[PDB]
Amino acid sequence: IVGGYTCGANTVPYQVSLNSGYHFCGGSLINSQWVVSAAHCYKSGIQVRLGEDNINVVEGNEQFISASKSIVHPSYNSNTLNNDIMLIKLKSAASLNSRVASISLPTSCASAGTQCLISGWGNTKSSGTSYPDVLKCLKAPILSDSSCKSAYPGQITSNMFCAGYLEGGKDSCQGDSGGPVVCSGKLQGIVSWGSGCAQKNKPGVYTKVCNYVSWIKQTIASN
């Protein structure tokens, strides 16, 4: 997260870190056994880390649980990042508490202008590289589809939306991929892509979660 703020420990209790020997992506806990992330974060041997603030220090509220299964969306296209969504099932149920809590799925899609909360452990610079140890947060509005499409001509599908600031300076970034965009208490986006980070006229592009609720519900009911 570029141009954000320090969230405060466990104030984003649905945020998870995906670890394969190192933090490499974020995710969102949607019930005690399931995490939503980005398909482009797929790899084998994922450990899910819940209840994290400082990802480099054990502070006492963490739960580390191995994934038993990963399910990439059946229409995910890695070239265009259309349908950039994946479900991860935990080997055992998380203990839900004040520091580890699920986020609701949307019943309806979010509106342009709604201020959302984006979070993660990704790069904090727009030029250069600095990875934080504690969780960072950004409030960012959903942009109109016309402005989104204008920013990325020929690349925006109906399963994507743009959030952020056309003037630049505030954005999600590498290492925040797969993490949450929460609007009005619902998971409405997944950190997906963008041209660099916090660049002028290049806002963040997010997976539009409300298009996937049927697939999520069906998948979870059968796995």
Binding residues for substrate: 171-172, 174-175, 177
Q: At 16, which amino acid appears?
A: V
Q: C-alpha distances in angstroms, 209 versus 63, 86, 157, 187?
A: 26, 11, 13, 7
37 included as an active-site residue? no
**DSSP one-letter code for 209:** G
Which listed residue (17, 37, 102, 177) is catalytic? 177
Size of interface with Ca ion, in residues (CB under 5 A): 3
40 included as an active-site residue? yes
Least distance from Ca ion to the Cβ atom of residue 30, Å? 22
Closer to Ca ion by CB, 60 or 74: give it.
60
158 included as an active-site residue? no
CB 7 within 8 A of CB 14: no
Residue numbers 120-179 binding Ca ion by CB under 5 A: none
Residue numbers 20-79 binding Ca ion by CB under 5 A: 52, 54, 59
Q: C-alpha distances in angstroms, 54 versus 3, 63, 131, 165?
A: 19, 13, 11, 27
Quick one: which of 14, 23, 16 has its CA closest to 49? 16
Which listed residue (40, 73, 102, 119) is catalytic? 40
Closer to Ca ion by CB, 52 or 176: give it.
52
Closer to Ca ion by CB, 31 or 54: give it.
54
CB 178 within 8 A of CB 197: no
Active site (catalytic) residues: 40, 84, 177
Binding site for Ca ion (CB under 5 A): 52, 54, 59
